[PDB]
């Protein structure tokens, strides 16, 4: 239905005069600048959290244990103590290396890891970002190695040529000898974001033991957790099952700063947008006190008919909300178009001003995604209306104190 | 009293109501600019503190600009220390910088080579763990590795490493072989930064690249954040300009791009505050129809009636920028003096605040200019109307 203070005040807003026709355009776009930008500004941070669990959190092992500068001899009977833990899903061994690439005198330091190609599909998704048609070429006895995208941009190589890497010296005792090198062909490249593409390389486990003259021995055991946030309590008790103490690490010391920085902008852009609508709510006060003294010959007519103080005070609260709801919804209906179609928008400005921004060198990703939700749209409508309630309550108390005896009635 | 006729017609207009609420509406345009400046200087003071902390830990530990030749190395007898007269340079020191690789008994890491002079003052002097400065003698091949570099290599004090130069290599008819020598370590150093993992100290005299001469001259600038203005100056002959943008050209350029996004996000507060002057002054002409037309009957020309509302739009921009910069400098300086007002971060590691005095003048002059461009449209409408139709 309709109320006495809502349905009878649509005709009060139909006011004309001199330059008052342009004030309703300024007051609409003045309050839409803190609503439409907050829709795109909050949905873009939700797009960064969507790509965080897909491009970063789904490729690096979270928990890693290593011995104190010793090869893992008893690594066969140390796998059952990890797998039968309430919170550990899968586990796979890995042998990390530190080798360089000298194929044309280029500066590139990669981190080669001895992952298992048959067990890499149980804990994460390694070959899910390879441009090749398949990934089943990782057999035993072909000395293949796959590198990232950032390695190929400096090596100036393609798929199917013999590149030269630097094998570290696998000496039994501490002595200096000639550096070991070998020529291997690359089996395709991989690209995720541009940040983890220049220092990422892997080798099969059957080919890593022949380069170090070792038998069945690894140097690290990875794992997979069900919940990721509690990564500092399930890896502590899983270390004393083999020996006294081992080198314990997690993803907090390396990639743990991304979850902190994605919540700091939400605790900064939120209060910075209250100051945008807060000055925009002063535009409602500037047109409400003017609507009292200019319409002073109308409030005295209602007081002679029997209007109480509770009715007159409720006149200009919802009257100022009519110009507030029209301007707040004018930023909502234009905020869906920018958020859902942000990918033709960001790519249009980068080809006009010259050099593009958001480069894939030290940043998080290359593109600017926007995962638009429907809970943030409801959270900005109440914020734009609660800030307009205090802007329409203080001129409403001034209009309620206007006695009809002072005015010429 | 008040012989200037422009300012006398607005002294009683800035505040006309007697109650406390009616006086607050006339000063609503001042607080919207005051809250916009103090939310712009304070937030950018934290971002300037992050750039100043990153400068003293990265740019303060590496050579910023090296004046090297274009035909290879540089002869010190042709270009002495008392020959260069470059602007912003307060100290000239020789250095030899080359992209080399490392070699140890455990792994093969990466790291550049920096040829320092032990007879001069070194910025990494308190970072050496019980290692003196004059232990880099020519012929003994001593090298001071980093702390994070020796962790992945496993080299303690008293071992031997191998330094190979892939770039500066000689010609050999059987192919391409690099020039490598033997180097013994004497100790490490730690500075709690990121440049300790790919930098090492070595003597200036070395025959591992060519020939004995140097490559260039290491210089110190008053402001290492900008090098584009110090590149088109009077450069000496036989030498080219090599700044720090060849390696860290995407790191410190990333901080300047993030300040332009936060500075544009917080610029929307003064954009709506400039729109409030159109509402505060545009509605004043529609109600004061009996005051604008009565001035033209007294003898006021329409050229002077336009500047009456111009000061009314400038009274919120001038006082709003001085009060906004005063309150913005008070929150940034007294942030962590007695108690954290905005909250306590999860680390608590002495959050720095850098307040640049030149940046306040650039910010305050923007709000003093955006408050006058929105004033020209209500001021033109007060003079374009005829003084005959306004009164009947």
């Amino acid at each position: 239905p309709l109320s006495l203070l809502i349905g009878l005040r649509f005709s009060r807003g139909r006011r004309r005069g001199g330059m008052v026709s342009l004030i309703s355009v300024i007051s609409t776009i003045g309050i839409a600048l803190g609503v439409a930008v907050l829709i795109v500004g909050l949905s873009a941070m939700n797009g960064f959290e969507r790509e965080l669990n897909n491009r970063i959190l789904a490729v690096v092992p979270h928990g890693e244990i290593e011995a104190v500068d010793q090869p893992w001899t008893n690594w066969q009977e140390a796998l059952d103590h990890v797998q039968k833990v309430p919170g550990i899903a899968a586990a796979a061994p890995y042998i990390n290396f530190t080798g360089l690439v000298e194929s044309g005198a280029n500066l590139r330091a990669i981190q080669v890891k001895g992952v298992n190609p048959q067990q890499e599909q149980r804990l994460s998704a390694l070959p899910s970002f390879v441009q090749g048609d398949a990934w089943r070429n990782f057999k035993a006895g072909e000395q293949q190695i796959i590198i990232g995208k950032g390695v190929a941009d400096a090596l100036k190589v393609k798929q199917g040529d013999w590149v030269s890497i630097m094998i570290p010296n696998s000496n039994p005792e501490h002595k200096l000898m000639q550096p070991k090198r070998v020529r291997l062909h690359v089996a395709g490249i991989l690209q995720l974001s541009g940040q983890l593409d220049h220092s990422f390389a892997m080798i099969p486990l059957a080919d890593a033991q022949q380069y170090l003259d070792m038998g069945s021995s690894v140097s690290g055991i990875a794992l997979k957790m069900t919940d990721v946030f509690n990564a500092n309590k399930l890896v502590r008790d899983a270390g004393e099952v083999t020996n006294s103490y081992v080198y314990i690490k997690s993803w907090i010391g390396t990639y743990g700063y991304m979850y902190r920085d994605i919540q700091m902008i939400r605790a900064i852009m939120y209060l910075a947008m209250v100051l945008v609508i807060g000055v925009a709510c002063f535009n409602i006060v500037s047109t409400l006190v003017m609507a009292v003294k200019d319409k002073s010959g109308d409030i005295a007519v209602l007081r002679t008919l029997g209007a109480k103080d509770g009715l007159i005070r409720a006149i200009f609260v919802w009257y100022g909300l009519l110009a507030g709801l029209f301007g707040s919804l004018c930023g909502v209906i234009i905020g869906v178009v920018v958020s859902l179609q942000l990918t033709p928008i960001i790519e249009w400005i980068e080809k006009l001003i010259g050099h593009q921004f958001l480069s894939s060198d030290i940043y998080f990703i290359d593109f600017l995604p926007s995962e638009l939700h429907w809970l943030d749209v409801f959270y900005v409508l109440v914020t734009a209306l609660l800030l307009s309630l205090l802007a329409s309550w203080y001129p409403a108390r001034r209009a309620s104190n206007i006695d009809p005896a002072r005015v010429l009635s | 009293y008040q012989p200037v006729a422009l300012f006398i017609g607005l002294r009683y207009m800035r505040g006309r109501a007697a109650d406390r609420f009616g006086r607050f509406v006339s000063w609503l345009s001042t607080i919207g600019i005051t809250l916009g400046v103090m939310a712009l200087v304070t937030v950018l003071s934290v971002m300037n503190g992050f750039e100043r902390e990153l400068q003293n830990n990265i740019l303060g530990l590496m050579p910023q600009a090296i004046l090297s030749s274009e035909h290879g190395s540089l002869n010190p007898q042709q270009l002495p220390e008392t020959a260069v007269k470059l602007d912003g340079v307060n100290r000239v020191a020789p250095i030899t910088t080359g992209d080399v690789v490392l070699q140890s008994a455990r792994s093969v890491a990466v790291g550049v080579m920096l040829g320092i002079d032990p007879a001069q003052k070194d910025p990494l002097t308190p970072y050496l763990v019980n290692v003196k400065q004059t232990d880099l003698e020519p012929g003994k091949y001593n090298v001071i590795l980093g702390e994070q570099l020796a962790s992945q290599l496993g080299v303690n004090r008293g071992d031997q490493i191998r330094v190979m130069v892939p770039s500066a290599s000689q010609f050999t008819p059987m192919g391409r072989i690099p020039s490598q020598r033997l180097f013994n370590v004497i100790g490490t150093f730690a500075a709690n930064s990121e440049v300790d993992g790919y930098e090492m100290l070595v003597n200036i005299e070395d025959a591992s690249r060519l020939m004995g001469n140097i490559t260039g001259w290491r210089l110190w600038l008053d402001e290492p954040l900008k090098v584009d203005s110090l590149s088109q100056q009077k450069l000496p002959e036989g030498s080219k300009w090599q700044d720090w943008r060849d390696r860290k050209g995407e790191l410190f350029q990333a901080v300047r791009m993030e300040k332009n996004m936060m500075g544009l996000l917080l610029s929307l507060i003064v954009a709506v505050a400039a729109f409030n002057i159109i509402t505060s002054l545009g509605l004043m002409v529609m109600e004061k129809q009996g005051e604008v037309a009565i001035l033209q009957t007294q003898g006021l020309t329409p050229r002077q009636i336009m500047m009456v509302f111009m000061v009314q739009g400038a009274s919120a921009g001038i006082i709003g920028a001085i009060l906004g910069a005063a309150l913005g400098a008070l929150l940034a300086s007294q942030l962590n003096n007695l108690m954290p007002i905005i909250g306590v971060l999860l680390d608590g590691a002495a959050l720095p605040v850098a307040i640049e005095p030149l940046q306040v003048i650039v910010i305050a002059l923007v709000a003093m200019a955006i408050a006058l461009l929105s004033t020209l449209y209500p001021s033109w409408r007060a003079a374009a109307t005829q003084p005959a139709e306004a009164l009947r």
Binding site: Y247, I248, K249, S250, I252, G253, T254, Y257, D261 | M47, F50, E51, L54, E194, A254, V255, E258, D347, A349
Partner: peptide, 10 residues
């Protein structure tokens, strides 16, 4: 962003 510490834990 531009606020990096890069400290590891053992």
């Amino acid at each position: 962003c531009s606020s990096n510490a890069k400290i590891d834990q053992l």
